[PDB]
Symmetry: C3
Subunit: 491 residues, 3 copies
């Protein structure tokens, strides 16, 4: 009238955070953690502390050959990736084609050292015209002009003597060398420009064995020209020489490029500002600080990135199902201001709440380990995802699409089910911890107290604050009170 | 003598449906659901409401050029995919080669609009022979003939003047244009056919810059010809012109094809009848209504398909382990005609079975949610799987095989373990629900009744049908009977 | 004083074997099994009972053409894969190129039958020089020499008549035929060697339609030659003929190769000894007997292999958490020398340990089934992983890298979490089995004994060894002792 009491119960709070499990939707929970990265900085950034190469309105081709309308950032000796606009304004001012263009973009995606040099001075042309090779297709300061890295040689007096030029690569580094051939409209143009009606370009290294022959066709005007310019490149290994021989139609090197190459990346299509940030993952829509194992921003990423996933939310339960003084069978305790599982007692020293420190620590460590495993076990490797295939490589681009789509389907499904399965395991862990605590107490107390059916025991003997602590400590001395208990019990 | 009784127990039935778990094989279960699609309709069907293109005995090449032995369905202005036989009877009647053939099949796999038109009338050949270009390799109505979409021009009198033809594309749509070159056997044939011993074909668009030259070799007879015909194509963008120039050996366009292209598919190898069905997934062996997330019919599918898996059965447990009146510790109740978990009682108003409505609904919703998650979380995207690589692309076909084989191994393993893990979780859920119901009752009754050890409680007081309902309702009033209970108990 | 007693408890031993779970690191456990293969035999071995082709210091090209410095194992009529060193010493002694080289290596990776034969005797050259075609680039026994499978024809007197040779393939098998063209340095060399200044090679089959033309360029010396030799191949189907015609610059077949092809493999880069072993999985670092579903040795494998994974350990718990006489609530029993779960009893016939045979068998079968599922459900297919793409195929090699890296990330993550999740399920199964055994006993004994709170019951009646067995058997007769129990109880 009335006896001393101890109750088992769990934490509750005012949280509205919701989570899904394999079996229940929209379960309200004490605390939750999102493992899906959804936030980008809306900028292009250095990658592992190396600037990109941003081509505002130029193609790689335009930029390499010196399309004179390409007003770009000139000096820039290394880069981690390249940014082009989808359809750049300035490409090949004089219409034509670039041989093995996509393989060269890929080779240039990421460069350790890049230094333009002069291999063949424009002034070294004594027996040909080095300053007439100019077109209204390639305008400079209003006047007709041409690509600035490469010379369109014309006949002098009425003569085009055979050209022979060797360049020996006396640098420490590989050289990227560029040249071209002119395909004219007809035999009149051919001889008006080069005198000789039948011409060739021959090029040789230790590797290269090339003979080019001009092609006449009747072609549509592009930039008001029916002619075409076709461009070619090689890498001249550090102790080799390249030997040019031509009769006509030769678009000669002036400037070449020293390059040092240490692994690849790709070409990103984006309209964004550079932003002086560093990052380990870049996206066409912005960079990411990538602690999380999953993201949903954009597929075409470069760096060490979370796995890309078709998903709005991946939320893990970390806390509990959120819902005298009755115990656990009736719901949670707002009064349990601290701890996850514990007690409410009432004796003659008064009443209150006490956390089970041991079982609460066990559980917080467990849930923290669960979240850290799901994050830390993720293998995260460098990759560069772009669209590097032209419109006669559609079968290979389709091969690339099945693979990308395949990994998206696998990661999306596996992340969704992983969250649903582990959410259900977590909520069931909390049920199992509460029920184990009740049994911890039931087994210590035996007949020295009575189960009230609501999560509480009423004692058959005076249990002061020290007896209470022994119960919470698992050190309750049953023999020391069996006598007193038995007397009140028999009655 | 004898006291009133309440028992906890679970549903049983006459089911022989078997399931596997991570720990036990061949467990008999109340109800189960297969998540592996195994049934096809044995037909080729429209795809998302668009007919295929079925080529009964023709190759794409034969069909485009008009091999005169190709007796196909003529009128057909759009299609979703193409069906060829493995080795079609009718290919190139006059032996030769088709330039970039596989890339063109891929481009034609799926077409929004397809309308043949005349660009160069057969009658517009005033100074050459338009009706002699005919071969016993290409038989029509018993008489010697040729491809019907393309003209084999021959010399007239003893003369082959230079041809110049422009066609300006004055249509709204892209044009697919086709032409060829004849490689003859020797210099006699060359001049017997074209008069001029040294010939070329030149072709120009805004894109194209082609010069073809015939090649003599000594070649084996094929369809009784040692000559070869080599074929070429381009897409003429809507405001461009194509310009032909030839000296000899020219196989001229007559008919070209207006095309509109909105995304790709592939070419399916199959021997099946069309069947007037629609579908969202087609297979070389039949279509599929694809609610399920997995199938085992065939890898080479087109559409939004289940994931392909090497597996005979993926069966999920949805029901229970299948096995006075004793309770749960002795097995299931055939008499529990309705509900999953519940009660059997006997008092002076009589005996019978009653379902625990609340815990049964909880569990049915849970299991239904589990099955719906495993199905609905599957990301399902359009894909087209074929064999599009020729016998000098074996390295790329091997790349495609590692990828396909890789996704099969991942999905097969993950589906098998997913079913085994969740089956074990489901059966353990049922054990946990039954044991919780027993404890729900044990905790309400306390000492007003005695545990019989078999899943039953014998009451120490008269419990009429209304007292019984309060127990099942969780509203049992212990104080209202503790008096009566205590008297029968002490004795 | 004192009463008979029965206790529930579990196996313990001196094991230090550690395991991780999703929630706890470094848990000590009774027994564990590694599912990660980490051991190789450091040798190259037959594959499914077929020898490899080991090229000690030769390239495939060198080996096919007969580079005279290639001192290899000569006779070898079938192989399962090819081994090259990274950069072989002996390649093309006379510098040049091999047309479609990588596709030919791939075709030759695995061969059912390989027999060299003579198609064109060196002696059958009556009107040309068959023994002058020799170079100081291609040294034999100190003297100048050449490739031994192929003849470098030179002019005789001062004449190079047109060559015409047919070879009809009168064998049962496909023929691999090899030829070349010589690109000389200048027009002097051209006529010094072949007399005729303007030359060609023409080659025809039912398939092939080739015309080769030599190319002059000014080229760097390689092996002290500025000339280049370019090589070509076809497969001559069993009833076809190949027809050669040349004017000059012809490197003629002498020997060709009968081949039978039944599926592909690849080319392995390795420095290892052959070792007379068989195997179903080979690695650049050694073979594997591949019972396990995962390995961490090397990615570039050939055969039916475990999945490659970035991981040091994948260890599964198979045993238990490892830790009067008190029962389970206080820890495990070293004395439980046999069985997993069971009993300790003490009556007047004496004390000791007894295994619960039924529940121990249930659990051992369960854990054995778990381990066997995780291993046996793995789909294991033939695959051949190499680096088959040249330095103008970098985009495709990058496509191959994303795919390989993608499957490594998926398998590594999924294996790690699979072990952590199932470890946690296994340890929780053991807790659940022990607690169920205690309740099995509590429910049989009811008030005929008292819970001591430590995992033990003290009986209220004499329980001899036969009464004890009925408890362990689940056949304990409560009525047969309720009388005796009640007397000692009331007191
Ligand atoms: C879950 O909650 C959201 C509201 O935030 C609601 O739109 C949704 O319909 C709820 N229920 C289910 C079953 O998804
Ligand atoms: C071209 O250059 C000068 C005339 O300015 C003359 O000496 C030379 O021979 C000229 N050649 C011809 C053939 O007109
Ligand atoms: C084709 O005709 C159109 C309309 O007459 C004209 O504008 C266009 O320039 C022509 N195309 C070419 C390249 O001549
Ligand atoms: C537990 O509680 C009792 C009573 O307060 C105290 O005397 C004892 O120091 C504690 N024992 C342990 C092992 O913490
Ligand atoms: C399971 O059941 C089938 C009979 O339907 C039988 O073939 C099989 O051997 C059984 N047992 C096991 C262990 O697979
Ligand atoms: C071919 O056509 C007619 C004869 O039918 C004649 O006028 C023409 O000049 C002929 N040409 C030759 C060179 O025979
Ligand atoms: C090769 O010889 C066979 C058998 O004599 C013959 O039937 C075949 O026609 C020949 N092949 C060619 C293309 O000449
Ligand atoms: C439960 O059962 C009792 C007894 O039949 C009934 O009076 C009461 O209406 C029910 N209570 C609830 C909350 O359903
Ligand atoms: C686990 O055990 C190893 C010693 O074998 C130790 O290096 C490691 O730090 C331990 N703890 C954790 C948290 O990894
Ligand atoms: C080459 O061979 C012999 C001389 O040994 C001679 O009969 C033949 O005509 C020679 N040809 C020439 C043109 O010198
Ligand atoms: C280039 O010059 C270097 C150094 O003078 C020389 O050794 C080398 O042979 C030259 N290369 C060629 C191929 O001439
Ligand atoms: C179990 O134990 C009792 C007592 O030893 C024995 O008589 C009986 O044969 C056993 N019963 C069964 C079903 O094994």
């Amino acid at each position: 009238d009335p006896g001393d009491q101890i109750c088992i119960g769990y934490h509750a709070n005012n949280s509205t955070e919701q989570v899904d499990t394999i079996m229940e939707k929209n379960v309200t929970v004490t605390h939750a953690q999102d493992i899906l990265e959804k936030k980008h900085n809306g900028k292009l950034c250095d990658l592992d502390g190396v600037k990109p190469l941003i081509l505002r309105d130029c193609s790689v081709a335009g930029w390499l050959l010196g399309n004179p309308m390409c007003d770009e950032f000139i000096n820039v000796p290394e880069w981690s990736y390249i940014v082009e606009k989808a359809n750049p304004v300035n490409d090949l001012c004089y219409p034509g084609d670039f041989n093995d263009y996509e393989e060269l973009k890929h080779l240039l995606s990421r460069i350790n050292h890049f230094e333009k040099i002069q291999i063949i001075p424009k002034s070294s042309w004594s027996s040909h015209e080095a300053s007439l090779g100019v077109s209204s297709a390639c305008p400079y300061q209003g006047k007709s002009s041409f690509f600035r890295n490469v010379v369109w040689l014309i006949k002098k007096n009425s003569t085009y003597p055979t050209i022979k030029r060797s360049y020996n690569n006396t640098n420490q580094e590989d050289l990227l060398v560029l040249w071209g051939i002119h395909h004219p409209n007809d035999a009149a143009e051919q001889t008006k420009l080069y005198q000789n009606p039948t011409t060739y370009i021959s090029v040789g290294t230790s590797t290269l064995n090339q003979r080019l022959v001009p092609r006449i066709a009747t072609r549509s005007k592009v930039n008001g020209q029916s002619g075409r310019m076709e461009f070619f490149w090689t890498i001249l290994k550090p102790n080799d020489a390249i030997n040019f021989e031509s009769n006509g139609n030769f678009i000669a090197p002036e400037y070449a490029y020293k390059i040092v190459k240490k692994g690849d990346s790709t070409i990103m299509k984006s309209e964004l500002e550079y932003g002086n940030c560093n990052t380990k993952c870049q996206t066409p829509m912005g960079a990411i600080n990538s602690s999380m194992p999953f993201h949903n921003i954009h597929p075409l990423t470069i760096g060490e990135c979370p796995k890309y996933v078709k998903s709005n939310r991946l939320v893990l339960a970390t806390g509990l199902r959120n819902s005298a003084i009755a115990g656990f069978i009736e719901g949670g305790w707002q009064g349990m201001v601290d701890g996850w599982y514990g007690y409410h007692h009432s004796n003659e020293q008064g009443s209150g709440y006490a956390a089970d420190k041991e079982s609460t620590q066990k559980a917080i460590d467990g849930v923290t380990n669960k979240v850290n495993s799901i994050i830390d076990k993720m293998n995260t490797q460098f990759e560069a995802v772009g669209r590097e295939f032209n419109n006669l490589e559609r079968r290979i681009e389709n091969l690339n699409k099945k693979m990308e789509d395949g990994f998206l389907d696998v990661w999306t499904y596996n992340a969704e089910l992983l969250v649903l399965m582990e959410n259900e395991r977590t909520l069931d862990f909390h049920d199992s911890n509460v029920k184990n605590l009740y049994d911890k107490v039931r087994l210590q107390l035996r007949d020295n107290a009575k189960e009230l059916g609501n999560g509480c025991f009423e004692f058959y003997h005076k249990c002061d604050n020290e007896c209470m602590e022994s119960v919470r400590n698992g050190t309750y001395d049953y023999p020391q009170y069996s006598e007193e208990a038995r007397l009140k019990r028999e009655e």
